[PDB]
Symmetry: D2
Subunit: 265 residues, 4 copies
């Protein structure tokens, strides 16, 4: 009886299906894959990347940036929703290949630095190349790049360091408040009496409320399907996109269902 072979983080093909840049607002573009969000915000003072998707997505991201007129040197900042392999995957490589520095909260920083290992729920099941944060941010802290202001909103649950980022762009000669809210799922998590996360339920409850109150004209999520985006649909990608309020409400209802099932017995 040999030990099991290691398994890589294999995923649905659509998570790895490359797409051309899709314009969300005047300065904001979806540059990831059909089923994983990676947002490029272009400012007069360099570019900002929010999430990168999977580890093998680095070169694709760089190719899309080039199409947008962004050189590796132009990329100044990487922000993250949470430090799982399907969102922070290519961060280490992007840091080696670009001028980009990472800003994240302490919880996301520590998970990123250990490459997603010793996950509270997944253990070492979903690892990726580790990276160091260049700046630690606090809840409500702002970062300004080229007159565009990004605000962090902590929403602990999916991971302890789960974060929503908000900024104001423009579209059709009008300000548009963009909310990139993190995942609110608890996929296979032990919810009550979890020794690794004693206040998990309380944190999720606060996070549902936080997501509801976000400045949110346009909502996007790390997994686009969670906010009902269809990136493959092009110009009508966000035709049926959920609001922050509807997103949180659906998430809490799922959560409540899971909590009920767990209580038996």
């Amino acid at each position: 009886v040999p030990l099991p072979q290691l398994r890589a983080y294999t995923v649905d093909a659509s998570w790895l299906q490359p797409m051309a840049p899709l314009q969300i607002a005047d300065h904001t573009w979806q540059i990831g894959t059909e089923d994983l969000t990676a947002l490029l915000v272009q400012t007069p003072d360099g570019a900002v990347l929010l999430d990168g998707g999977m580890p093998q997505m680095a070169s694709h991201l760089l190719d899309n940036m080039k199409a947008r007129g962004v050189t590796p040197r132009d990329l100044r900042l990487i922000l993250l929703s949470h430090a799982h392999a399907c969102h922070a995957g290519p961060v280490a490589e992007l840091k080696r290949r670009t001028g980009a520095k990472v800003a994240a909260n302490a919880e996301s920083a520590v998970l990123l630095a250990r490459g997603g290992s010793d996950d509270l729920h997944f253990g070492d099941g979903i690892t990726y190349p580790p990276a160091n944060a260049d700046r630690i941010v606090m809840d409500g802290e702002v970062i300004t790049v080229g007159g565009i202001v990004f605000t962090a909103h902590f929403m602990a649950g999916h991971t302890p360091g789960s974060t929503a980022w908000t900024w104001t762009d423009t579209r059709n000669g009008k300000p548009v408040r963009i909310a990139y809210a993190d995942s609110l799922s608890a996929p296979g998590y032990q919810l009550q009496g979890n020794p690794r996360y004693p206040h998990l339920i309380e944190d999720y409850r606060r996070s549902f409320a936080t997501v509801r109150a976000l400045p949110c004209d346009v909502l996007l999520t790390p997994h686009p399907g969670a906010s009902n985006w269809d990136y493959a649909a092009g110009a009508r990608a966000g035709a049926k996109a959920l609001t922050c309020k509807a997103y949180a409400d659906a998430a809490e209802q799922k959560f409540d269902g899971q909590l009920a099932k767990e209580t038996a017995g």
Copy 2:
């Protein structure tokens, strides 16, 4: 004109006056200096150290451990109230010289790893040797060593990673609920509109309430004066020590006055 010389974190003499171990309960001892707390909890499964004081206290702590019958190998765990120089100072050296591993929350861990540099309020004024945390703890998480159970209570404010640790020891044939609550001070802090700590006020207010509600037969604090301990007085050191409620009340009062003067 030459740039100013660097300035060291210079402290009151009493913070640097060694003392012999002072018994708090059957397994819990104050082993730091007269004016800085360092708590040794001795179990049949090894020893736990809560805070180490200043960087220069490492050898003294080891002297006191040996006096208590705890070898460098016997020290298993280091816990921290917060990662300032006056409490986490000797952690790196203790890690090199003992079997000890550090458990801390993410905020304390990142501050520890940068040796207290780029402090939200103090800049680089209070640096110390950096150290890596061996285990990251979440709010309410328990750590059991030799049948003694330590519980973490996050109380953000003084630092983002400020933590209270509680455990039950025995004294006089009865259980004693010990609370090692962190500093609730905001010394010279900008409280409102602080870009480095936007929700400082909310965190402090939650922390006052957390401390007030702690399981707390005996309160100890990293700076013993904050809870009215006098370690140099020996047997009557904690005779007039504050309750957790009194400690939080005084802290909130001081905070409220500071906030009023700022607005």
Copy 3:
């Protein structure tokens, strides 16, 4: 066509075949798998582990330690030949589950801390959970545990941080000088004009000489086949083992052939 799926570090079944502790000398035991070395060296003051094999080997190592009378508290030190996945794999987990601290040279420490990512030759193909070194060692430095003294001998090549560890144990009332020499292979490596490792050839050449000159009654290697050990043969496991000289000479030959092939190509 989507981006390629991630590929796991899959290995020969024999690398993952657990074995019971095999005694090498009075205080030195092989406790890994049939085809990956993990050495337990015991003293009255605690135990040392030299290498752990693959990431999935953690629980097996702990079980074998238990069988040898080494509790998690008794494991004091982890040393490494080199920080590849097939030798440092379970180090992070062992640190979490035991009192063990890691001592390694700066090169090995930096590779361990990035979990084998950005490997000079393998890129991100062989990643594992990252870990921090607790102590940095210099060439020729000794570490004493109980009455046993371990000496580091730097032998850069296979990795920049490649190290041989030597100590003296006993067998049949007599001292036995054990040499745990690191790998001297260059599997698929670009040898000449490698921008990531300009002095690769020079380092290997000095390393062949270093291995040749080690205090060496008993040679052991991270991959037992390299020193002609057969861990499945029990009492006769080391009956056909190579000397340090023979091991270095064969490795230099192989290397010379590889260099000639590269030069021709």
Copy 4:
């Protein structure tokens, strides 16, 4: 009673700000009168080799501004060795600029612990820790614009001590600049040092390495070691040592120290 914490107090000249002093077409001394901090500026970004003391961060930034180098323009930080008097402001510079650090493994580990647990100084000279972004190997090259930097390991003063070499121009001719690290062993236990068993061997190799460097112009982290006088402006390098003279002087001093140690 226990002693107070120590601050790294230094000679006034080490903290004496100076305006940028041109060494060659791309290369400027931008530190203080008695601590080297070299700025190399290209159309594809600037490189800083050493920063001096921790309190020098704002001064370096002011001098960069004077040279037309914005915080965003600063791409790379290289180090001679990771002591407080050279890597001091690195953490702050990383926070305030786009700069990333390239260093060898030895320098990276020392930098990450802010100079603490020094092989010889213990915790006597500490500074704010920083992480390296790129690990370099011996002989590795880094290209920024038209400038090519080559690393030459010269272990001794610290395990990670490195010389950096590049070719600039001066009056229509190539000038091979060698920024050689310290070859001093101040108060060091040389023989039988358990923390550095092969110290003597490494130093002797390092003297030879420095002697052989491509070296039209030598600069050193402590400029006095190579007989530079930065305060003298246009005359600063008029009596600068060759790489050979620098290495020879260092070896003679080292030999003297070893003799004294063996005798005592």
